[PDB]
Amino acid sequence: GVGRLDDLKRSPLFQNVPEDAMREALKVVTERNFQPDELVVEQDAEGEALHLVTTGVVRVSRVSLRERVLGDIYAPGVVGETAVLAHQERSASVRALTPVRTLMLHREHFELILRRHPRVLWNLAEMLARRVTFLNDELIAFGQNTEAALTHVFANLYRQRLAAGVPQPEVLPLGTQDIMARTSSSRETVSRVLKRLEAHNILEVSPRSVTLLDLAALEALS
Amino acid sequence: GVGRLDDLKRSPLFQNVPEDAMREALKVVTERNFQPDELVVEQDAEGEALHLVTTGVVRVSRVSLRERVLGDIYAPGVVGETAVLAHQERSASVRALTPVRTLMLHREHFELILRRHPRVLWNLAEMLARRVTFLNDELIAFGQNTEAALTHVFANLYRQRLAAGVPQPEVLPLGTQDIMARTSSSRETVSRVLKRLEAHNILEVSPRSVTLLDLAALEALS
């Protein structure tokens, strides 16, 4: 369906923002639907437009001229927001993992809303600050060892799944290939680490998922 | 000396901000000076206070309960700004590399300035967005290979030194240990990569520095 105020009320960008800001945004958004495996993009506004992710899950990646997956975004979420502020542009790919409904906002309109409604800008700054903190944590983890890398990835994906209210959040939809692409770790080291965690009753490894049994034990074991 | 309007005019946080915003800030900052190797911190406001770095260079690190150096910040710069927005707190260390003069601002005062003067908040959001882009680039580089890691570190540190207007910006003040701490790479791989770059006339390696001879060749060779 067309954009509703409900969509914006639930968006991290519009938390505790005045109703008139949300209604101004609604006049300039366009509903866009994507099926599993389709790229989230607006033709003729590649790398520019913002998408409020209202349902579903998307995967964000950067592919070399080999894909490194940066992470997933569960509804309610946002993609393309780091561009209205950083004029810097890079070959990012956003692919729907499930059916996904978005509200597309062009850069010029998002800029106007930010300038006119400081509470929306405050929400964006908070989101960006959390992303910086997260990425510093990620760099620390990945620079340590595969064990630290997996703990970082699993604990944070679990928290995202809890926040999204999805069924079976503890059943992380990652296979060995997914883990390697998300962490840049070898099959040998990923396998070794997963077997030791399964041996300590911290998790259960299936071909298409990792089931977290004891989060506290995973995070403690560091 | 006590805070001057000159300090704020040059700060990334106050670019194109109205004069009255800067004068409001000046009423609530405190000059703090640090000598080489001293920790930049305000006693009783550990992890809270913001510091505008007006002269010198600081190094930012996270030390485990082993130090991973996140990077350096050249004046005019800022430290502690990702906290007024992310209530998340972590054991970061900021150490002066040279003599450093700062203007300290308490969190509550920085929050007030941000709420009252949206242009300062816009500057912060831009800074954070650039940091996210940079950290994504860093994760991509470090996940590839030591060669990509060194190119990322060297090109970006050179740009920082150019921006800071320091003498001999091409003479990067990094030894092998510094490079290992900044990238989490082994001595063997760092040594191998540096010798091949020196062999291609891309740089010159000294015990306490790496002199960049051909930036374009370093970045091209990827």
Domain with CATH 2.60.120.10 in chain A: 1-144
Domain with CATH 1.10.10.10 in chain B: 145-222
- A 32-71 residues inside an 8 A Cβ radius of B: 62, 68, 70
Other Cβ atoms less than 10 A from the Cβ of A106: the count is 17
Q: Of all residues in chain A, what percent are helix, strand and coil, respectively (each to 5)?
A: 45, 25, 30
HSE at residue A24, side-chain half, CA atoms within 13 A, is: 16
Q: Which CATH number fits domain A145-222: 3.30.70.100, 1.10.10.10, 3.40.710.10, 1.10.357.10?
A: 1.10.10.10
Report the first-to-last Cα separation within chain B, whole angstroms.
Answer: 46
Q: What is the DSSP letter of B1?
A: -
Strand runs labelled E in B106-201 = 171-172
* Whether the Cβ atoms of residue A211 and residue A172 lie closer than 8 Å to each other: yes
Q: Which CATH class is domain A1-144?
A: mainly beta
Chain centroid to CA B184 = 18
* Closest of B55, B101, B49, B52 to residue B74, by C-alpha: B55
* Closest of A144, A123, A25 to residue B128, by C-alpha: A123
With an 8 Å Cβ cutoff, are A70 and B126 in contact? no
Which structure tokens are listed for A139?
């760099």
With an 8 Å Cβ cutoff, are A114 and B121 in contact? no
What angle, 0 to 180 degrees and rounded to 10, lies between the N-to-C axes of helices A176-183 and A187-199?
Answer: 120
Q: Which helix (H) or strand (E) holds B19?
A: helix B19-27
The method of structure determination was: X-ray
- Contact list in B for residue A88 (CB cut-off 8 A) is 130, 133
Q: Which of B68, B85, B133 sits opposite A140 (nearest CB)?
A: B68
- Contact list in B for residue A123 (CB cut-off 8 A) is none
Which structure tokens are listed for A151?
């703990």
- Contact list in A for residue B132 (CB cut-off 8 A) is 82, 86, 128, 131-132, 135
Q: What is the DSSP letter of A167?
A: S
